[PDB]
Amino acid sequence: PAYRILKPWWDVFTDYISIVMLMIAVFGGTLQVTQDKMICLPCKWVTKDSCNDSTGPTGIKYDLDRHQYNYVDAVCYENRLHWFAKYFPYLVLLHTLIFLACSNFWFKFPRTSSKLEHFVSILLKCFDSPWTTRALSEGVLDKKEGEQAKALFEKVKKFRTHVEEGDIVYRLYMRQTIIKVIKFALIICYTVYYVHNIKFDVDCTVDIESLTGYRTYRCAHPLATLFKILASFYISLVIFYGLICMYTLWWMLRRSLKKYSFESIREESSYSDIPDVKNDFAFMLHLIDQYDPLYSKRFAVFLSEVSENKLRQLNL
Amino acid sequence: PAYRILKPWWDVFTDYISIVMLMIAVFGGTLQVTQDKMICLPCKWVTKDSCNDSTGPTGIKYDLDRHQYNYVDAVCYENRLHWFAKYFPYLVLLHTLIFLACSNFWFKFPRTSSKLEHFVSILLKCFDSPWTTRALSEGVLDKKEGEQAKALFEKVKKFRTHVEEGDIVYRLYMRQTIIKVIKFALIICYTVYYVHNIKFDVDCTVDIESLTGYRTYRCAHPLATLFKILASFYISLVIFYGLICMYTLWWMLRRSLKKYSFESIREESSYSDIPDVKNDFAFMLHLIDQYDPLYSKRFAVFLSEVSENKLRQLNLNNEW
Amino acid sequence: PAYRILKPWWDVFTDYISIVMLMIAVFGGTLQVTQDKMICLPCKWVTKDSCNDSTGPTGIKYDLDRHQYNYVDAVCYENRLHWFAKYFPYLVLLHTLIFLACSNFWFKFDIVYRLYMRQTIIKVIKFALIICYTVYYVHNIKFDVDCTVDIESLTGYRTYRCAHPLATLFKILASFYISLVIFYGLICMYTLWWMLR
Amino acid sequence: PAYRILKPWWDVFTDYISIVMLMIAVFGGTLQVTQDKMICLPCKWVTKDSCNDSTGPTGIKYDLDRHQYNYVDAVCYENRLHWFAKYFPYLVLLHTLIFLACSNFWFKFDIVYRLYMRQTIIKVIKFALIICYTVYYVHNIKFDVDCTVDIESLTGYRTYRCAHPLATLFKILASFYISLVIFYGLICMYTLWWMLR
Amino acid sequence: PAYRILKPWWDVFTDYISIVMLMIAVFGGTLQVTQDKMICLPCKWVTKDSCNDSTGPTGIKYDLDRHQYNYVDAVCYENRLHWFAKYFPYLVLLHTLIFLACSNFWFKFDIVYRLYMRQTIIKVIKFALIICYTVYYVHNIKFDVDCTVDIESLTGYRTYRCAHPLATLFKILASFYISLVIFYGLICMYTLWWMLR
Amino acid sequence: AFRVLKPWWDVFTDYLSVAMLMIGVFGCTLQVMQDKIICLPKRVQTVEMKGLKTDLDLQQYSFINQMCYERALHWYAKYFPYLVLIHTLVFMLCSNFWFKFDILYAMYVRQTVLKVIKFLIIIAYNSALVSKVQFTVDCNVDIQDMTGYKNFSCNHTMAHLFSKLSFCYLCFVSIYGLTCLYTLYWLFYRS
Ligand SMILES: CCCCCCCC/C=C\CCCCCCCC(=O)OC[C@H](COP(=O)(O)OCCN)OC(=O)CCCCCCC/C=C/CCCCCCCC
């Protein structure tokens, strides 16, 4: 849909980070689905609901069947294992889905999507028109090419009139980035202060004494360390994502995006009456600047009435 | 395709919510197919078919084989596990499929499909027409572009006559929205009332003493709280869907969508002859205004007859 | 392609119902391939090849290995489980494949009118056969199946009481499958009604 | 592409038959790679390498561990199961692939007409060999399998009576396969006569 | 796209080697999720954390439940196995992703010449570091692991002689990786000379 | 389209290499299965027969399984699909070597000669080492200290399948080498 020119480097980096967070979430989720088991063994010596831990050695017989063990595993995996250690992959699924929705909201919101595709289409049309090249290099003009040149001038004028009035795209991108930064802050706060609860050895005390005979059990969690690693790795990526997001907000407070200055482009060129555009038109011009200012240079000559005068006398 | 112009923001929102709902359904379905089980342990001491819940401690011996234990898990998984905890993902898949079929119901229904493709085709090709630029600019008219503009004028008049008679698309969209909102209400009701039955601990009494020796067993359903939170998550999605649909229904009852007015466009433009379209014409024009007013502004000229007279004058000067 | 003008509303809904029935078919086939089995416990008390069904409770010692249990499950799946309860997803696969072959035969082949009329008659009578033949046998899918295979010389018992885990879910498939077939026939009814009017 | 004018109805029908044969081969290979096994219990009371087949009932203790049982199952799966019952999916896969290569021979290879003539002779003679070898060996698959591998030095018994759970499936698969091949061959046979006349 | 003809032969060679080493990493990850365990058998003669080893043969009774065995194996795997043997596939997966991202970073962003400078330098330096760290730790992918955790309060033993099953194959997989990277490194040095030409 | 300069031998080799890759994927799927070897001790301690009590746990049995997989089963018998996959990757890499490269004649005969020698080496090695894929295996690992038995007899579950796959693989490489030798004969028969 040729929207790639409208997503700057920060948007592409955040989308890649969200894709790899989706990968992390999928891997952690399938591991938690398939092989997230807890191996619980009772402790014989109880010291006030605490485990005492005290020629040829002989194995310790608990007289427990293979289902009694599976029941105590389920009970101490549910009741006593901390909820983050169980539902971290689902948390990162929800968070990366919300991040992707925030990123592509203004792409999929028709009120701003229509304006965006309008702006993209006319930029692409002005990219290939040759009056742009004649004006920037500043004559022969074929009837057809002069016709679409004047038509494109008229679309530029009407579309500047249509877009310059409102600031819905600018305010929506404001809302998008502030929501992303506040949710990144919440994600880091809760994840940082909850991550340490992933532990390989867990001592559960669930009182299934009527069903197994033991009160306190010591359980291994073979997928804890891996989760820990993934958690750490996931946290690191959010750091990267978080940093990138702040850049965008910093950029969006670096200067007022609701106004644009054509001083450099019209100063280096002959056409000195190119007007300084505002609002949504200025904002998507800023994004195209962050992609390539050559697009802004190529488009800037259709905004002047002096170039209209030159085109009229050349066409005459 | 180019049907995205007919889908406002609420339709896109519901489509994405339905995609996520289908993902939930598939995840729960493979969970129930592969890992869903029960770990059922007999109660050694019982009191009237109820678990009494009664020198280092030692284990309790049940003298049950692995095959007897499998039988106990199977029987207490069918007979005493709540059916919601078992067939929640299949219910979610059914609800998602019905929602998706309702969303694309007017798309594939031929009587509305023909109107929709005709409207989309002539709207897009009217947008592509340079006569809109030449007219809202206000002769500048080639023989060929004047000919295709006359053909498009004829096509627009023909389609207006063809589609003004029936308002079937508006009624179909009304029916889809009302069906979606009532299905949201039903889903929220039964899911809220039944989500409390997904619990980890289940006391089963299946009366297989002749085969195992124990009357009552205590079972742990491992995928219970998960099947709770997913369901809770699912409920949240439905709420969003419903709210979205609610707004859509409100949007289709605040003003009459079968009476369109070109007052703003025909006031800001020089043409004051553009009439007010009705019925399905008005409904699809309102749906397009939910996309942008620009498409309606560039098609209002082709809907006008004074612009047709001006074009006819231009072609008359072109030929003569 | 451009043949959508030759596919009316009934054709579109029948095609969508056919795809949905194909999903049900492949789901049932995957379940049969992966998780279809039985759990069979011997009956301690017997009375002429029938389970007699006759302080703290204790477990019954069947005195059998795990592999003799596996042999009992295999033999009571081969002998005393009904063939339809074992082959229902495959029969539904065959019905859906032949149904797609009948519905889309004229696309891949007054010749066209003859094929269309033959396909309509075939699909109506085939809906009737499918609904009758599936409603008739749907009671053979039971949770509990008592098996009696005479493997005493290899196991030590004559009677067992198997349980089929994926049975009732198949029921939840089968009725729903039948329901889809019902809807198909309903559409067919309207088509025939339209073919009368 | 636009080769449907160069592909007549018999080539398309044989291609569809080959597709069905391919998915039958895939299903058989999947079943054999995941769920294929045998379940062997020794014959406790034997009379000259033959199973004699003879207060409540107690399970027979063979005193074989689950691993000894696995050893017996594998050893009897090789040395006594008929080779067709084990290699049917691979045989049908090879036959389907060679049929595909033969049917799609001119599409990447009056010399074209003579090439099709030789291709039809090769395909029909392979059909003849296929139908002969398949028909002769369909009835060489049985559920209950005798086994006399003489492994008394490792488990303590000589003769075993195993169960082959998906064996019947293969027969049924083979059964359907026969029909496909016959159809394919019959269709191809017509083509030969269609070019002979 | 528009970058097909710019790449020389060595770039295509690097791309092919990257794809091979990509699916090597992926297949290793599948093996790690599937069959990554290790089986510990407790030592019957333990004298201060040391396995002494000082008619028909008979087995040894350890009197451990299968679940105590599971606890022993899990603890000896997450406490007495080197991070390299446990996380070989996730680390090589990270190396694949970083290598591919650095190979294609200039697409996503003489600034282009300086970018491709930095990417080639990063590629060659990471080749060097990967070779160093891999050959420095390749010895720890070995079968026999004498684990000693002292969970005798739960098992009654203190040392176990485990043997990692998917290790030697992992070893040869690792071997394959380094050999591939070696050719990659060779090609990389060529690129270095070109971009130092 | 180079199909004009692609005679029958090149297309035949392409389809054969696709078949090689399919065979290698199937063999890798066979090696994916956890149950690989099954080991029981030897000389373990109308006539009614009784089962011999090996006095072994499940984990002891698994330990002997992996040990006899280590030290008794042949390396080719354990990574035959692995070699097959690597060698078909080599086949598809060097099959288009003349296309992806009197220099034209030179690199074409170079491609044909390299393909021929790879075929001949594969034939020699496969014919030499194919006999090592046996079902009944005798294993003499020294795990008497942990299990109690010093000699074992094992069965490799899919050894027959690997032998059949190797027979099909040898037939495929045989057709490959026959058509490539015909290519070499056509190339060097005339200038
Ligand atoms: C948060 C949700 C996000 C998405 C997650 C979707 C959930 C997917 C649901 C299940 C997926 C696979 C279904 C498997 C069912 C069959 C189970 C089965 O046969 O038994 C489990 C079986 C045996 O396990 P245990 O006996 O514990 O192992 C021995 C202990 N040492 O476990 C397995 O290893 C399963 C087989 C592995 C394949 C499943 C996928 C695992 C993830 C693969 C990682 C690498 C994939 C790379 C992707 C390639 C993409 C190009």
Side-chain angles (χ1 to χ4, degrees), chain E:
Chain E
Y3 332 114
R4 38 188 172 185
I5 60 176
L6 182 69
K7 308 314 188 300
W9 47 293
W10 60 70
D11 207 307
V12 191
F13 264 50
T14 50
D15 216 8
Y16 292 157
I17 295 182
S18 296
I19 296 175
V20 184
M21 191 223 77
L22 195 44
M23 81 204 96
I24 283 303
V26 171
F27 165 48
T30 56
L31 284 204
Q32 210 276 344
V33 61
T34 317
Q35 338 168 6
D36 193 354
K37 47 185 168 54
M38 62 90 107
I39 289 304
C40 302
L41 275 182
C43 267
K44 274 312 290 203
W45 302 286
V46 172
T47 313
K48 178 45 172 181
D49 287 339
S50 175
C51 308
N52 201 14
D53 193 15
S54 58
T55 64
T58 317
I60 307 297
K61 303 290 307 319
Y62 296 126
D63 301 350
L64 304 174
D65 312 344
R66 183 181 169 266
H67 218 67
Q68 285 185 352
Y69 276 114
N70 285 348
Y71 193 91
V72 161
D73 305 338
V75 168
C76 282
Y77 177 79
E78 289 283 343
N79 284 18
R80 293 296 189 269
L81 200 52
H82 174 187
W83 320 338
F84 187 69
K86 302 162 55 183
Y87 315 124
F88 171 77
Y90 304 153
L91 293 169
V92 54
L93 177 63
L94 182 60
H95 288 336
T96 67
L97 261 53
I98 273 284
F99 251 80
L100 270 53
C102 293
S103 68
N104 300 333
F105 176 61
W106 53 321
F107 301 8
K108 103 175 56 175
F109 216 85
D110 58 333
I111 186 64
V112 183
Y113 174 82
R114 284 186 297 176
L115 219 54
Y116 195 13
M117 225 52 257
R118 296 153 198 173
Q119 288 148 196
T120 301
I121 289 178
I122 278 284
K123 214 172 311 303
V124 66
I125 205 59
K126 197 183 181 60
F127 141 74
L129 294 173
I130 271 171
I131 286 309
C132 289
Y133 252 80
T134 309
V135 77
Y136 185 45
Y137 283 6
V138 86
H139 68 282
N140 281 296
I141 317 188
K142 193 53 209 94
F143 263 51
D144 293 310
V145 184
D146 296 30
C147 160
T148 304
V149 161
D150 203 349
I151 48 189
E152 162 223 17
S153 63
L154 296 161
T155 304
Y157 298 83
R158 281 176 276 110
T159 77
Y160 324 93
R161 183 174 199 91
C162 328
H164 192 214
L166 46 54
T168 290
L169 159 68
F170 265 25
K171 203 174 194 174
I172 212 74
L173 284 185
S175 180
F176 190 38
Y177 170 105
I178 80 153
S179 45
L180 283 188
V181 168
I182 274 180
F183 323 117
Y184 204 91
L186 289 173
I187 303 169
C188 270
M189 93 196 278
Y190 201 98
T191 311
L192 216 32
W193 160 58
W194 180 70
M195 256 207 187
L196 275 176
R197 206 174 296 174

Side-chain angles (χ1 to χ4, degrees), chain A residues 115 118-119 122 152-166 260 262 273-282 285 299 302-305, chain B residues 298:
Chain A
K115 215 171 281 195
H118 203 180
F119 185 109
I122 317 183
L152 198 38
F153 218 122
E154 206 83 355
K155 317 157 50 183
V156 155
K157 204 60 81 202
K158 294 214 82 53
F159 141 76
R160 176 198 186 189
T161 279
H162 153 244
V163 165
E164 149 73 1
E165 294 220 348
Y260 189 110
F262 281 101
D273 88 320
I274 284 158
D276 280 347
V277 303
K278 296 204 335 222
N279 289 16
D280 292 313
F281 194 52
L285 272 192
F299 194 85
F302 291 20
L303 281 155
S304 73
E305 302 285 89
Chain B
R298 320 290 170 210

Side-chain angles (χ1 to χ4, degrees), chain A residues 26 29-30 33-35 37 90 93, chain B residues 27 30 34, chain E residues 30 33-34 37:
Chain A
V26 152
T30 191
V33 154
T34 294
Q35 293 196 333
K37 53 175 61 49
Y90 313 152
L93 223 35
Chain B
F27 173 64
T30 172
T34 73
Chain E
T30 56
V33 61
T34 317
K37 47 185 168 54

Side-chain angles (χ1 to χ4, degrees), chain A residues 245-274:
Chain A
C245 155
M246 315 151 65
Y247 195 93
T248 310
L249 201 73
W250 165 85
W251 182 76
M252 287 196 16
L253 319 169
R254 190 227 292 182
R255 43 181 175 183
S256 176
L257 329 169
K258 286 198 298 183
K259 96 191 60 173
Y260 189 110
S261 46
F262 281 101
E263 268 69 342
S264 292
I265 306 108
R266 84 178 159 186
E267 185 185 8
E268 67 209 31
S269 209
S270 184
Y271 312 104
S272 297
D273 88 320
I274 284 158

Side-chain angles (χ1 to χ4, degrees), chain F residues 29-88:
Chain F
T29 313
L30 293 178
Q31 303 274 40
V32 152
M33 271 305 148
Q34 297 182 9
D35 198 312
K36 32 151 191 66
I37 209 164
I38 297 175
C39 292
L40 266 305
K42 205 80 153 53
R43 285 165 291 269
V44 51
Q45 40 100 19
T46 288
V47 179
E48 264 255 359
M49 301 95 88
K50 292 179 179 179
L52 299 186
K53 319 276 293 173
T54 36
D55 265 352
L56 287 181
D57 320 328
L58 284 206
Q59 261 209 16
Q60 271 172 299
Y61 272 132
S62 301
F63 200 92
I64 318 157
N65 283 352
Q66 41 177 269
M67 217 84 182
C68 297
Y69 193 58
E70 282 156 40
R71 327 261 309 280
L73 198 39
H74 198 292
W75 271 28
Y76 169 67
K78 300 190 298 184
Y79 327 93
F80 154 79
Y82 265 101
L83 165 153
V84 160
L85 221 56
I86 298 304
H87 264 232
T88 166

